[PDB]
Scaffold this active site. Sequence first.
Site, mmCIF file in Angstrom:
data_model
loop_
_atom_site.group_PDB
_atom_site.id
_atom_site.type_symbol
_atom_site.label_atom_id
_atom_site.label_comp_id
_atom_site.label_asym_id
_atom_site.label_seq_id
_atom_site.Cartn_x
_atom_site.Cartn_y
_atom_site.Cartn_z
ATOM 1 N N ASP A 1 0.833 -1.241 0.000
ATOM 2 C CA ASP A 1 0.000 0.000 0.000
ATOM 3 C C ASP A 1 0.857 1.278 0.000
ATOM 4 O O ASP A 1 0.492 2.305 0.606
ATOM 5 C CB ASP A 1 -1.019 -0.039 1.174
ATOM 6 C CG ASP A 1 -2.311 0.792 0.912
ATOM 7 O OD1 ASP A 1 -2.662 1.084 -0.246
ATOM 8 O OD2 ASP A 1 -2.993 1.129 1.917
ATOM 9 N N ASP B 1 -0.273 2.041 8.382
ATOM 10 C CA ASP B 1 -1.333 1.269 7.689
ATOM 11 C C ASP B 1 -0.772 0.000 7.065
ATOM 12 O O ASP B 1 -0.279 0.023 5.922
ATOM 13 C CB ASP B 1 -2.064 2.073 6.601
ATOM 14 C CG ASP B 1 -3.413 1.435 6.221
ATOM 15 O OD1 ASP B 1 -3.588 0.213 6.450
ATOM 16 O OD2 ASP B 1 -4.334 2.157 5.732
ATOM 17 N N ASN C 1 0.104 7.371 3.255
ATOM 18 C CA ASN C 1 0.529 6.461 4.307
ATOM 19 C C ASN C 1 1.934 6.766 4.870
ATOM 20 O O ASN C 1 2.458 5.981 5.676
ATOM 21 C CB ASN C 1 0.492 5.001 3.756
ATOM 22 C CG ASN C 1 -0.971 4.437 3.622
ATOM 23 O OD1 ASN C 1 -1.956 5.015 4.161
ATOM 24 N ND2 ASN C 1 -1.107 3.241 2.969
ATOM 25 N N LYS D 1 1.953 4.817 -0.906
ATOM 26 C CA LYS D 1 1.326 6.028 -1.473
ATOM 27 C C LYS D 1 1.561 7.185 -0.482
ATOM 28 O O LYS D 1 1.838 6.932 0.682
ATOM 29 C CB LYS D 1 -0.189 5.827 -1.701
ATOM 30 C CG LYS D 1 -0.978 5.462 -0.464
ATOM 31 C CD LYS D 1 -2.469 5.216 -0.817
ATOM 32 C CE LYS D 1 -3.179 4.595 0.354
ATOM 33 N NZ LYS D 1 -4.700 4.506 0.164
ATOM 34 N N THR E 1 -4.344 0.774 -4.250
ATOM 35 C CA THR E 1 -4.987 1.918 -4.882
ATOM 36 C C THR E 1 -4.645 1.922 -6.376
ATOM 37 O O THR E 1 -3.470 1.659 -6.730
ATOM 38 C CB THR E 1 -4.492 3.211 -4.206
ATOM 39 O OG1 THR E 1 -4.699 3.089 -2.785
ATOM 40 C CG2 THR E 1 -5.213 4.404 -4.688
HETATM 41 C C1 LIG Z 1 1.069 7.296 14.099
HETATM 42 O O1 LIG Z 1 0.244 8.450 14.180
HETATM 43 C C2 LIG Z 1 -0.823 8.477 13.239
HETATM 44 C C3 LIG Z 1 -1.548 9.611 12.924
HETATM 45 C C4 LIG Z 1 -2.581 9.597 12.040
HETATM 46 C C5 LIG Z 1 -2.903 8.477 11.364
HETATM 47 C C6 LIG Z 1 -3.934 8.490 10.348
HETATM 48 N N1 LIG Z 1 -4.727 9.555 10.051
HETATM 49 N N2 LIG Z 1 -5.504 9.246 9.081
HETATM 50 C C7 LIG Z 1 -5.203 7.974 8.714
HETATM 51 C C8 LIG Z 1 -5.918 7.275 7.581
HETATM 52 C C9 LIG Z 1 -7.286 7.865 7.219
HETATM 53 C C10 LIG Z 1 -7.063 8.873 6.088
HETATM 54 N N3 LIG Z 1 -5.784 8.483 5.482
HETATM 55 C C11 LIG Z 1 -5.205 7.356 6.238
HETATM 56 O O2 LIG Z 1 -4.160 7.476 9.486
HETATM 57 C C12 LIG Z 1 -2.222 7.348 11.642
HETATM 58 C C13 LIG Z 1 -1.247 7.342 12.609
#
Ligand SMILES: COc1ccc(-c2nnc([C@H]3CCNC3)o2)cc1
Length: 340
Positions: A156, A174, A161, A158, A191
């Site tokens: 994944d 992710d 992430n 991109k 994606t």
């Molecule tokens: C390690 O600290 C973080 C902070 C934010 C996020 C996070 N914020 N949003 C997402 C997903 C939804 C929209 N794009 C990916 O991950 C993950 C970890």
Amino acid sequence: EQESVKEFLAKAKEEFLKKWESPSQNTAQLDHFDRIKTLGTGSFGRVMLVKHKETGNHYAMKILDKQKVVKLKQIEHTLNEKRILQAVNFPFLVKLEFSFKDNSNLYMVMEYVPGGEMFSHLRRIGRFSEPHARFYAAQIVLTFEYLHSLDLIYRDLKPENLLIDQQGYIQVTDFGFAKRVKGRTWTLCGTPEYLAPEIILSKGYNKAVDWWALGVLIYEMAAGYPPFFADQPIQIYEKIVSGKVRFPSHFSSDLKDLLRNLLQVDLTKRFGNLKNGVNDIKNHKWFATTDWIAIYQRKVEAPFIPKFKGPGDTSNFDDYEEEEIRVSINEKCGKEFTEF
Ligand SMILES: COc1ccc(-c2nnc([C@H]3CCNC3)o2)cc1
Ligand SMILES: COc1ccc(-c2nnc([C@H]3CCNC3)o2)cc1
């Protein structure tokens, strides 16, 4: 390769396998935390900023709804994500600190990175200079060298992430499509803009798909847009399989040469998947100024440091409708998630 690199990767695989074979489980619960803000959403869950009530430390808590995971055929992928995250350890990967489940949801609690997603900073500035793109690309090359030596494929890559931390370095988040794979695998996932030709053509594929995605990412960082785009996915797929790409004139000759060898449609000819593996990339002329050891040790001054006020600042993330975290009085899908 030097024996110091070989011994480092042999120890990394030993430490991974010990945790992989005996995973940690049930290491906190929901009412140990206060909810602060929703940081982003997705198809079957969201990520929330939380504060631990006894220590005061901030975390990013990823919340997945069990019933929706089952309906969208993601049970195996969710179990992969948590099992891999609790077993890895590398300077450019997010750290998982706790995990647990209840009657309705699965939870993965990670250290919070306040600098925001690379996607936001790239779209704000327009494009990155080649030295700036190269600083980020070097961190992804080392991270894939580590993951692939553990027989893991990431699947994944991109800009959304890749989080930017308080030192200006990358932390990859992710692991929802990451998998341990001995030879080939077959699932359609990713994606559209980043998919390798062999995924689109429904073949059995391997770690070469991550090196194709690195070519798409470096092109996007240096140009400001990805190489293959259109309003319908079927049109994106036809461009990916054609074997043609066009480069901006401001690209260096060295950058164009590297990208032709990563965006190679024949996977048996693609950089990263030849006899010399990752060393065909590390030794390419585009990386001639890169000190690989200094990057790993975090000793190189970053191109920029995100603006933020403290460890709980949310100003580099955007605004979403705030919805309840509701937990049913009856257990849902207990059998499917026994191992979590
Ligand atoms: C390690 O600290 C973080 C902070 C934010 C996020 C996070 N914020 N949003 C997402 C997903 C939804 C929209 N794009 C990916 O991950 C993950 C970890
Ligand atoms: C109806 O035809 C199909 C086609 C593909 C799949 C499928 N694609 N991925 C999976 C999971 C099993 C392998 N790991 C994830 O099933 C299922 C049915």
